[PDB]
Amino acid sequence: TPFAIKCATDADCSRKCPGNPPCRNGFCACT
């Protein structure tokens, strides 16, 4: 799914779910 937690960047991924997980299609990879 190129759709998940709405992200800007890695840092933003981190902002929701820490440890700097990656984003793809501007969505954070973390569940």
Residue-range domain boundaries for the chain:
1-31
Label residue 10 exposed, middle or buried (CB < 10 Å: 0-12, 13-18, 19+).
middle
- Give percent helix, percent strand, percent coil of the chain, each to the nearest 5: 25, 20, 60
Sign of CA dihedral 22, 29, 12, 26: positive
Which method was used? NMR
Amino acid at 12: D
22-29 — which CB contacts under 8 Å span 24+ positions?
27/2, 27/3, 28/4, 29/4
